[model samples]
Target chain A: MIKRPIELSHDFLSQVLDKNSIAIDATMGNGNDTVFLSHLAKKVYAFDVQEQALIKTREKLEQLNIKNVQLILDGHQTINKYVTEPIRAAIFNLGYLPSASVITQPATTLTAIKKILERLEIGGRLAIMVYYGGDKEKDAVLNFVKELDQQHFTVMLYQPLNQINTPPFLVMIEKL
Target chain B: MIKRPIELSHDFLSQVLDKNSIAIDATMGNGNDTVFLSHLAKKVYAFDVQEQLNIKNVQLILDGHQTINKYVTEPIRAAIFNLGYLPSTLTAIKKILERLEIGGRLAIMVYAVLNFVKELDQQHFTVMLYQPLNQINTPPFLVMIEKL
Candidate 1:
């Protein structure tokens, strides 16, 4: 029974990271993941789709007096166009923004994940929690994972054995 | 999920034993337990119906090079004295128990174990009990752990 990275990471962080490495919050959302990464790593690069998300995240970061945050309000797919180099870890909490969109217009695209994976440094860890309440999104994620290059990566999938429609698993990939 | 000490020891010794430690096999039986104890302990004093189990167990222990102290009549058969007799006789069973030297672990595989605790000083020794799930002749073993 393998588990997703975030599920494992909560325990793994106490082992893998100290307070000097950098982490990427690919989907900053309400700023929770960004704040967590910012505290755990040397710096945090947080991205969100909406301006409100970015503003809220920035205010949250500022409230904590955390100055090592780089907040971007736009598409996460354009991350490379804005920044350079690979990050130590990437986290994506998929689905709509909390309390705002009962349904999100633009969800995290699979192509963006590939771009981020490519930008991940060697030995970097990636955690992707995908939502599958609908058919289209689940199939897209499945296809992306199927075509993902395994030559330099280790992929792990953890889906419930019995609970089929509870919105299946979080996928983890460790870049080798 | 938790394994008793007897099971753990048995599993470990299925590989190797501590030759330097003193060891006890409470149920001498036909002396197979004594043979096992001999390999691990420097000295072994096996107590069974000794002279009572007839030559069969004597030969069994002899075949394994086990030294023994028989308590019953000469040339006695094992079943003759031990078969139907209440191990109640073990109540006065104050034979060479004091001969068990220190630094040895005891392996007590018997149902009369609850009686052994009363017979032997409770604070002086450790008794490892192994209870089998499918055993027929005896009740499941209850390991009484004690140390001087």
Candidate 2:
């Protein structure tokens, strides 16, 4: 039902989603992921602390006529508080919001990740895109991955080896 | 008197040479470094095994006149020989002697060369500069670390 497949990362993300899949993007940012998730899922709920972020996401969803998505204006750390039903797949783009939004308060932390993991349904997939080259959030992200409970979750961390200075990595977790 | 400072590697290769300088390209295989050096140097002396490669380099030099700095695609005065079989995909000739003769200075990046070619009354020195050198090869990879 799509024209051209999403470039670069879409190939990998497409395999993780099924029709009517319940997907959540923790860092809704500008709602690019929310819009993308809307097309592939029956219902999608995205979260961000910034009100402008929620509005931008809403405008994008409305422009595309993607109505099933529920845009929540709250910190992703509180996702466990609101999310009652089981989420099959969730994606977290960890770091400050890019474009228009500066790194004002920052969004994620280890404790928040622990909350998300605690609420994640068994066999659910979580894609944590960790951007490590930022100023304030580097230690929090690394400590999260370092103290991650290996016994409960099987993890795969993919990093671009050739790139310089920009320390970018993706951590994929499958709740076992 | 040298007009431009000598650059050790790709890190410094760009800084010293401008878009135009009189550069001496010691080895011009498919003209990777030659193409780059040609743009930097006013005149380039390219040396390689394949005669077809020389011709191809000439055509490339012409088409790349916008980027290229050199005027000709001639073989080097001397070139270091890799005494091994050439790849079956393309024709290769041995021309190490030719590359060494053409250039004012030589920067060899390969296996250890035990002896210097003093045949042309050339007072050259073959050396081992690094301490605690890895004993993989008999002499070592970088033989001409110091200028002869």
Q: Name the candidate that leads on TM-score.
A: 1
- Using Cα atoms, each model's DockQ against the true complex is 0.02, 0.02
Best by lDDT: 1
Per-residue lDDT tens digits for candidate 2, residues B51-144, read: 5343222232223221222433343321111222344800111122232222222334343132333212223322221111212223212212
Model 2 stretches with alpha carbons more than 4 Å out: A1-13, A99-108, A133-136, B1-148
lDDT of 2 by residue, A1-176 (tens): 11111231343455556765777878888888888878877788798888888988889987887878888888777777777777767777766776653442334455566676776667667666666536457555544555556557655444432223555555556666
Give the alpha-carbon lDDT of every model. Answer: 0.52, 0.50
Model 2 TM-score on a 0 to 1 scale: 0.48
List candidate 1 segments past 4 Å from native.
A1-6, A12-15, A18-20, A102-108, B1-148
Please state what fraction of the native interface contacts candidate 2 reproduces.
Answer: 0.00
* Cα deviation of A72, candidate 1, in Å: 0.4
Q: List the residue pairs that clash in candidate 1.
A: B52-B77, B52-B78, B53-B78, B125-B146, B126-B146, B129-B143
